[PDB]
Amino acid sequence: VSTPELKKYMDKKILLNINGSRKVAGILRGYDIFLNVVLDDAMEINNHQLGLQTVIRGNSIISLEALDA
Amino acid sequence: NGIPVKLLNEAQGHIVSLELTTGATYRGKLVESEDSMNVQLRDVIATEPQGAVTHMDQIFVRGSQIKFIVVPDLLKNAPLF
Amino acid sequence: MKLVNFLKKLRNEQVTIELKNGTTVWGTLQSVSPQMNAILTDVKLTLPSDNIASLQYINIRGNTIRQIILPDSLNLDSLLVD
Amino acid sequence: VIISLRNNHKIIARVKAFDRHCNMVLENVKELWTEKKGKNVINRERFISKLFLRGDSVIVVLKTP
Amino acid sequence: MKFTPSIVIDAPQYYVDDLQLETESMPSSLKHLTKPTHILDLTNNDLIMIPDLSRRDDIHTLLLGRNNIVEVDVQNLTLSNNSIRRFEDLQRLRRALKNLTLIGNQVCHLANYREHVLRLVPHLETLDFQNVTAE
Amino acid sequence: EEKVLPLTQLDEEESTDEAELINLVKGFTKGGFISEEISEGSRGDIWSSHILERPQQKRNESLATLLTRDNITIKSVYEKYLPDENSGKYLPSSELPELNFNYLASLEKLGQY
Amino acid sequence: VAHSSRLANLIDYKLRVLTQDGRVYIGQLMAFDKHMNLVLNECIEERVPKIKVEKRVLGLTILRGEQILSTVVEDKPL
Amino acid sequence: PVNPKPFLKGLVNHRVGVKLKSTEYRGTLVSTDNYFNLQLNEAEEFVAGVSHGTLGEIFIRCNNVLYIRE
Amino acid sequence: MVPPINCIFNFLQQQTPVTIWLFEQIGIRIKGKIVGFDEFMNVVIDEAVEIPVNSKGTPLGKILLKGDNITLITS
Amino acid sequence: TLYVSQLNEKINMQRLRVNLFLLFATFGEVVSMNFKKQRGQAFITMRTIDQASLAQISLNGERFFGKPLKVEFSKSETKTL
RNA sequence: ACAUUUUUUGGCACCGCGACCCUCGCACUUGUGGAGUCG
């Protein structure tokens, strides 16, 4: 029901720890009540970027640990 | 509404511990919690399932992937229940 | 329509229950929730090639219970009536 | 009718009940699996008189005429 | 003051500094605890023999201070200030046990008491609050 | 009896010894009834023997055990009381199933319908 | 243990608790949920590595019901 | 313009194949619903691209599905 | 803020190279062009291509990949 | 509460506390950190005051894990008390 | 009172143990000396 308060993390680069012991990086552009994430693109953790912007599904997110403070 | 949720909310401010499905325990000041246990935490250490530990700043965790949360024992006293 | 109702109607039955992790559970169903959370009494947990562990009271969760093995004698049509 | 299941159980049985979740009350029940710790090859099956079933288990039901 | 079911049911129950029950001449009727305790405190009682227990799978700590234990019929066993007098009376502990305390028992002053315990109860790692060492 | 209950939670000959030792008396008869019900062979008759070590209902259990031994059970029924309806039930079991067993009960009953 | 109807009626009893990962949480149920989440008063996680019981005292714990398998009664109140 | 549900509707009485959470399938689609549970005829079980058996008339549960294809 | 639904819509409008990751499945990915949109994450994606991940290329037709097993999008 | 110092700081914290509990249970129903500041020390809290006094007199200089422990009454009252 | 992402329609299944040495300190605890060897 309530919105995930990620307005602190808006327009900052975040380590999206994602399903299956994987990772994603990138600057936060948006989100919704299901915790889907819209982010301006970055690499999959040696390293290799795919995409210009990226959208991560809600279910898939383990964590979204902030790279910037 | 859920009393565990309420408890979690109350624990805001306090240093909660927090393990996930992965089995990666965290400890930190609980910044914010929601009805779905969508926890944020500050000044947080992060243990790997195998053993090794890593310091980190402001972790967010989605309650779906959370397993169990340890709250400080002062909250036992009052006045939610 | 609802199997939940049927489950509810099944009371005081000494039954085996099978879980998603394969644990065989011999006990008397004292009650079941609307969401299939089984509440047993006189319970007996055995695995599917190792020794047994008995317990007085077990509240098993609805998501875990794969198959509840029903009793020997049971009138099903009657049960299925609203 | 036969049912395929998440845990490798071919449930050959007579259907009694049916709902939104695809939970089923079953009579004349005959499951088929294989208790086997590798390398080994065994094919096992047991009769059960009456049996309730949960729906998340069900992958694909089928009807052999 | 028999150790009875009624006695156990009104006994202080708490989480210690493990689940512990706060507790007599003879140890009996433990069935009523229902195997729900990690620790049982039997200090300051008049028990003569450490015996009479039902099957208790939980029970990991037994504090039996200041009783009259003279014979023995589990990870920690504290028997301080009791009546065990002969090295051979400690033999039944070989069948259990990592923390053992037998201080203030006459048996303590017997020649070779420490080495005897170490060889006959090798599973003990700490004896009388001192590390069992290799030497 | 609570120790017998905890021991029951813990729960064959030695176990039978522990149970018989565990068996106020009405609860023990209820336990023997629990044994007669749970066993529903010869071991149940042994439970009846332990029950003897512990009456018309016991005779009914003896009927469930079903021939001279049954006559011995009838002798136990005679031991149970000098005489009122339960004795008539004993004569009834005697008549329903040894013609002398029925004729004797008919004689004691004799002691227009 | 007593012969209860529901979980709610047996509040504050010392509880064994199993979870999908195989750990065993033991402690007094302070509060229940619509989704079977449990508050435990004095919680001890007991785990078994692939041998013998490893033990950890936690404290006051909110425990999510998703991960909960089944609950058993360890002892009476107090 | 083409959403999924309408596509699904269109594809009734036509060949389809389904992967699972894994084994491939192959059969003619009978009907579908909002939850994306399936009912097929002439079902063939492609065990990683190997038609192990031909079952015929089947009903696939939605949550085990991975994707639909012609 | 840019919502996910909005992003999806934009992608659809565009018709661009989309590379989807599978939930709880590392080794495989999908690569195609978004055609459909749903209330949930489910979409239809014509001219799709299955990819084995670098720890080549494989043939694949038109597909709807179900919303529950999606992970990543990019377009 | 009694304050103990001169303790062998090589014992792991949970083992130290459990032996401390065991040893001191003989006098009545019964805090230790390994920080630089607090290592080799412990505060043992008893329900009864007579128990604390008896413990102090009887275990003064008791060899524990190799060293003679030094016991004293704590400076302040324990939060729990 | 009801199944399509956060709970119950599941992604299931096939620091410690030997050695050495540092610290004598009045607390409320993720954890706690350091060098070196073993796992």
PDB file of C-alpha atoms in Angstrom, chain E residues 9-16 18-20 33-38 60 75 97, chain G residues 1 14 16 26-28 41-44 46 52 55 57 73-78:
ATOM      1  CA  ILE E   9       4.750 -26.434  37.601  1.00  0.00           C
ATOM      2  CA  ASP E  10       5.009 -23.494  40.027  1.00  0.00           C
ATOM      3  CA  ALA E  11       8.774 -23.236  39.737  1.00  0.00           C
ATOM      4  CA  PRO E  12      10.398 -20.075  38.444  1.00  0.00           C
ATOM      5  CA  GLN E  13      11.015 -20.502  34.726  1.00  0.00           C
ATOM      6  CA  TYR E  14      13.195 -18.040  32.789  1.00  0.00           C
ATOM      7  CA  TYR E  15      15.856 -17.377  30.144  1.00  0.00           C
ATOM      8  CA  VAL E  16      19.187 -17.300  31.941  1.00  0.00           C
ATOM      9  CA  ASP E  18      19.320 -20.784  27.788  1.00  0.00           C
ATOM     10  CA  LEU E  19      15.908 -21.873  29.036  1.00  0.00           C
ATOM     11  CA  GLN E  20      16.422 -22.723  32.726  1.00  0.00           C
ATOM     12  CA  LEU E  33       9.056 -30.384  32.476  1.00  0.00           C
ATOM     13  CA  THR E  34       8.208 -31.840  29.062  1.00  0.00           C
ATOM     14  CA  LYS E  35      11.812 -31.672  27.840  1.00  0.00           C
ATOM     15  CA  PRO E  36      11.470 -27.867  27.520  1.00  0.00           C
ATOM     16  CA  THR E  37      14.660 -26.762  29.332  1.00  0.00           C
ATOM     17  CA  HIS E  38      18.278 -26.283  28.292  1.00  0.00           C
ATOM     18  CA  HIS E  60      22.347 -29.477  28.218  1.00  0.00           C
ATOM     19  CA  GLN E  75      27.339 -30.882  27.882  1.00  0.00           C
ATOM     20  CA  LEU E  97      30.120 -33.867  28.323  1.00  0.00           C
TER      21      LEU E  97
ATOM     22  CA  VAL G   1       1.502 -29.296  27.134  1.00  0.00           C
ATOM     23  CA  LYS G  14       8.019 -21.317  25.099  1.00  0.00           C
ATOM     24  CA  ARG G  16      10.336 -24.540  19.226  1.00  0.00           C
ATOM     25  CA  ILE G  26      13.324 -21.359  20.319  1.00  0.00           C
ATOM     26  CA  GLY G  27      11.555 -18.715  22.467  1.00  0.00           C
ATOM     27  CA  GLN G  28       8.301 -17.404  23.990  1.00  0.00           C
ATOM     28  CA  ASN G  41      10.745 -12.965  23.742  1.00  0.00           C
ATOM     29  CA  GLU G  42      14.028 -14.778  24.386  1.00  0.00           C
ATOM     30  CA  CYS G  43      14.992 -16.291  21.043  1.00  0.00           C
ATOM     31  CA  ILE G  44      17.777 -18.813  20.476  1.00  0.00           C
ATOM     32  CA  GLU G  46      19.839 -23.544  16.982  1.00  0.00           C
ATOM     33  CA  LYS G  52      25.869 -31.701  16.426  1.00  0.00           C
ATOM     34  CA  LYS G  55      23.759 -22.627  19.202  1.00  0.00           C
ATOM     35  CA  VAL G  57      21.281 -16.611  21.528  1.00  0.00           C
ATOM     36  CA  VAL G  73       5.708 -26.215  22.230  1.00  0.00           C
ATOM     37  CA  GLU G  74       8.966 -26.491  24.235  1.00  0.00           C
ATOM     38  CA  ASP G  75       7.591 -25.866  27.757  1.00  0.00           C
ATOM     39  CA  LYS G  76       4.925 -24.157  29.901  1.00  0.00           C
ATOM     40  CA  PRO G  77       4.795 -20.373  30.712  1.00  0.00           C
ATOM     41  CA  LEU G  78       6.965 -18.335  33.177  1.00  0.00           C
TER      42      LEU G  78
END
